[PDB]
Amino acid sequence: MKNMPENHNPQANAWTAEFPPEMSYVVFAQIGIQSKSLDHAAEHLGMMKKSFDLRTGPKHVDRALHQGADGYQDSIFLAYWDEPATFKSWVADPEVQKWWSGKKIDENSPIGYWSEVTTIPIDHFETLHSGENYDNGVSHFVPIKHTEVHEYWGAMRDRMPVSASSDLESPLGLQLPEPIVRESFGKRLKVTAPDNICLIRTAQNWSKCGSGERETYIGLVEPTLIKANTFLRENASETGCISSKLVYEQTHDGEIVDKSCVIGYYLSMGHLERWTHDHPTHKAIYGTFYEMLKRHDFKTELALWHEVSVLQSKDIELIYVNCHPSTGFLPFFEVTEIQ
Ligand code: HEM
Ligand SMILES: C[C@@H](/C=N\O)c1cccc(Br)c1
C-alpha cells in the first residue's frame, strides 16, 4: 500500500481473488502445439484434451490460438491447479505420459511441442477484475472480493503481498540481454530462467458486449492492443519483455470466441511497470479504453482482468521440443539439451 495516493477513491469498482487459507500455490501450465497447418496439430490436441478430465486434471483449463510470425501457430492450453501435489499426480498418469514433454515428437516432425509450467506461491500472486466475473482464470474456482487497491500506478505491486517485504528486482539488474538465435528445431531444449521474473496474463472479453460497444472495442481499442503486443515482441531489450503472445480463446472444439489475452514474461515486475506507466503503446490502449467508456456512459459490458505472478527459477519449467527459435524463452538465459 506504499503507492496508494492520499485521499484515494477509485472511480470504478474492481475485484480481486481471495485465496482460501489452505491454499499455498497455484500451478499455471501453458502447453502448446506449434504448427504451420492446424491439421497437423489435431491429433496431439485430442490426446491432451482427453487428459484434462482425469480426476487429477486441472481445476480449470482455457484453450487459445496464437498467430506467431513466419506463419507458425501455437495451439495452447492454459491450465490451472490449486494443489501442486495433484498436478504432479496428473503428470505421472500414463495417459499424460504418452505425450508429456513432447514424447510423441520426431526429429523431422512438422509440429513442435512446448510447455511452460509455473508453480506460483500465493504470496507472489495477485489478480484484478473489472467486474464480479467468475469466469476469469482462477476466478473459476477461487472466490473474488471487492477491492479499492486499483486505479493508480503501483496498485498491482501493492496487491501482491510479498511486495511489502521485497523489491522484487531481478538478479540480472535492469538490462535484459538482446535475444540470441539458437538452433532449436530438431532438439529437446530446457531453459533455466533467473529469479523474480514476472508473468502477466491480461485478458479481454467482449462476449457480453452489446452490438455498439463491440464495434467500438474492435474498431478503436483492439488495434492498439495488437500494436502494443507487436512492439513488445520486437523490442525485448528495450522493454525487458522476454516473451509476449496475443492469443484468441477457443471453445473446446476450436471455435474462436470473443475473448483474448496477452501472456507476457518480463525480467522483473519493474520492467512491466515502467512499460505500462510510461510507454506510448499502453498509453494508447488506456486512452482508447477511456474513449470507449465516454461513448457508452462509463458503464461497459467489456470484461477485463489479469493475473500477475513473480517467479523463482526453480518454480518455472520451460521445455521446447522442435520449436521455432523465437518461441518463448528460447532466445534468453541458459539452455540445456534434454536426453
Ligand atoms: C499487452 C497488453 C497489456 C499489458 C501488458 C498491460 C499491463 C498492465 C499492468 C501491469 C497494469 C497495472 C499497473 C499498476 O497497477 O501499476 C495495467 C493497468 C491497466 N490497464 Fe493494462 N495491460 C494490457 C492491456 C490492456 C487493455 C487491452 C486494456 C483496456 C482495453 C487495459 C487497460 C488498463 C487499465 C484501465 C488499467 C488500470 C487498472 C486499474 O488499476 O484499475 N490494458 N495494465
Ligand atoms: C486488468 C486490467 C488491464 N490490464 O492488465 C484492467 C483494465 C481495466 C479495468 C480494470 Br478494473 C482492470
mmCIF file of C-alpha atoms and ligand atoms in Angstrom, residues 12-14 126 128 149-157 159 200 202-204 217 221-222 224-225 228-229 232 244 262-264 266 269 272-273 275-277 282 285-286 288-289 292-293 302 304 306 308, ligand 1:
data_model
loop_
_atom_site.group_PDB
_atom_site.id
_atom_site.type_symbol
_atom_site.label_atom_id
_atom_site.label_comp_id
_atom_site.label_asym_id
_atom_site.label_seq_id
_atom_site.Cartn_x
_atom_site.Cartn_y
_atom_site.Cartn_z
ATOM 1 C CA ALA A 12 -14.724 2.295 -10.863
ATOM 2 C CA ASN A 13 -15.300 -0.916 -8.934
ATOM 3 C CA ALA A 14 -12.830 -3.774 -9.178
ATOM 4 C CA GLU A 126 -2.462 -11.081 -7.484
ATOM 5 C CA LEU A 128 -7.708 -7.750 -10.763
ATOM 6 C CA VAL A 149 -6.498 -1.330 -4.356
ATOM 7 C CA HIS A 150 -6.555 -0.335 -8.019
ATOM 8 C CA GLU A 151 -6.670 2.711 -10.306
ATOM 9 C CA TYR A 152 -3.211 4.030 -9.518
ATOM 10 C CA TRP A 153 0.254 3.226 -10.765
ATOM 11 C CA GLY A 154 1.730 0.818 -8.242
ATOM 12 C CA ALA A 155 -1.587 -0.823 -7.360
ATOM 13 C CA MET A 156 -0.524 -4.125 -8.951
ATOM 14 C CA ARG A 157 2.624 -4.218 -6.814
ATOM 15 C CA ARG A 159 -1.885 -6.102 -4.304
ATOM 16 C CA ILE A 200 1.150 -11.492 -16.635
ATOM 17 C CA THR A 202 -4.059 -9.856 -19.102
ATOM 18 C CA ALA A 203 -7.375 -10.605 -20.727
ATOM 19 C CA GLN A 204 -10.149 -9.007 -22.801
ATOM 20 C CA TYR A 217 -13.854 -2.352 -28.939
ATOM 21 C CA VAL A 221 -9.317 -0.436 -28.752
ATOM 22 C CA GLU A 222 -8.204 -3.794 -30.129
ATOM 23 C CA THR A 224 -3.903 -0.538 -30.010
ATOM 24 C CA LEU A 225 -3.654 -3.856 -28.158
ATOM 25 C CA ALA A 228 1.327 -2.961 -28.113
ATOM 26 C CA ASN A 229 1.906 -6.718 -28.326
ATOM 27 C CA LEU A 232 6.728 -5.894 -27.002
ATOM 28 C CA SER A 244 4.712 -11.661 -25.353
ATOM 29 C CA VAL A 262 -1.809 -11.223 -23.793
ATOM 30 C CA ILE A 263 0.582 -13.558 -21.982
ATOM 31 C CA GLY A 264 3.903 -11.921 -21.247
ATOM 32 C CA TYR A 266 9.227 -9.710 -18.027
ATOM 33 C CA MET A 269 7.773 -6.560 -12.205
ATOM 34 C CA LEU A 272 6.323 -4.411 -16.655
ATOM 35 C CA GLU A 273 5.517 -1.350 -14.518
ATOM 36 C CA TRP A 275 6.296 -0.150 -19.801
ATOM 37 C CA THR A 276 2.707 0.125 -18.578
ATOM 38 C CA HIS A 277 3.161 3.534 -16.960
ATOM 39 C CA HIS A 282 -0.011 1.113 -23.283
ATOM 40 C CA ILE A 285 -4.541 1.429 -25.009
ATOM 41 C CA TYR A 286 -5.628 3.252 -21.855
ATOM 42 C CA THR A 288 -8.834 4.306 -26.384
ATOM 43 C CA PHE A 289 -10.359 2.444 -23.437
ATOM 44 C CA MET A 292 -14.703 3.777 -25.243
ATOM 45 C CA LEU A 293 -16.021 4.452 -21.738
ATOM 46 C CA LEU A 302 -16.430 -5.334 -21.677
ATOM 47 C CA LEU A 304 -11.087 -7.053 -18.322
ATOM 48 C CA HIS A 306 -5.337 -10.022 -15.267
ATOM 49 C CA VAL A 308 0.286 -11.355 -12.304
HETATM 50 C C1 HEM B 1 -0.186 -6.067 -23.748
HETATM 51 C C2 HEM B 1 -1.320 -5.917 -23.054
HETATM 52 C C3 HEM B 1 -1.368 -5.270 -21.650
HETATM 53 C C4 HEM B 1 -0.430 -5.224 -20.683
HETATM 54 C C5 HEM B 1 0.975 -5.892 -20.657
HETATM 55 C C6 HEM B 1 -0.997 -4.475 -19.580
HETATM 56 C C7 HEM B 1 -0.394 -4.206 -18.369
HETATM 57 C C8 HEM B 1 -0.983 -3.548 -17.314
HETATM 58 C C9 HEM B 1 -0.492 -3.511 -15.946
HETATM 59 C C10 HEM B 1 0.781 -4.213 -15.430
HETATM 60 C C11 HEM B 1 -1.326 -2.761 -15.220
HETATM 61 C C12 HEM B 1 -1.192 -2.457 -13.701
HETATM 62 C C13 HEM B 1 -0.271 -1.262 -13.462
HETATM 63 C C14 HEM B 1 -0.236 -0.937 -11.988
HETATM 64 O O1 HEM B 1 -1.217 -1.249 -11.266
HETATM 65 O O2 HEM B 1 0.792 -0.378 -11.526
HETATM 66 C C15 HEM B 1 -2.387 -2.296 -16.102
HETATM 67 C C16 HEM B 1 -3.436 -1.472 -15.744
HETATM 68 C C17 HEM B 1 -4.482 -1.088 -16.554
HETATM 69 N N1 HEM B 1 -4.673 -1.461 -17.874
HETATM 70 FE FE1 HEM B 1 -3.389 -2.632 -18.971
HETATM 71 N N2 HEM B 1 -2.259 -4.061 -19.943
HETATM 72 C C18 HEM B 1 -2.526 -4.522 -21.213
HETATM 73 C C19 HEM B 1 -3.698 -4.345 -21.939
HETATM 74 C C20 HEM B 1 -4.781 -3.547 -21.604
HETATM 75 C C21 HEM B 1 -6.063 -3.421 -22.299
HETATM 76 C C22 HEM B 1 -6.475 -4.189 -23.588
HETATM 77 C C23 HEM B 1 -6.788 -2.516 -21.623
HETATM 78 C C24 HEM B 1 -8.208 -1.975 -21.912
HETATM 79 C C25 HEM B 1 -8.928 -2.247 -23.007
HETATM 80 C C26 HEM B 1 -6.009 -2.053 -20.495
HETATM 81 C C27 HEM B 1 -6.385 -1.093 -19.572
HETATM 82 C C28 HEM B 1 -5.846 -0.899 -18.324
HETATM 83 C C29 HEM B 1 -6.403 -0.117 -17.232
HETATM 84 C C30 HEM B 1 -7.709 0.711 -17.256
HETATM 85 C C31 HEM B 1 -5.582 -0.238 -16.178
HETATM 86 C C32 HEM B 1 -5.774 0.393 -14.785
HETATM 87 C C33 HEM B 1 -6.408 -0.731 -13.949
HETATM 88 C C34 HEM B 1 -6.702 -0.365 -12.519
HETATM 89 O O3 HEM B 1 -5.766 -0.368 -11.672
HETATM 90 O O4 HEM B 1 -7.890 -0.084 -12.216
HETATM 91 N N3 HEM B 1 -4.797 -2.701 -20.524
HETATM 92 N N4 HEM B 1 -2.141 -2.791 -17.369
#
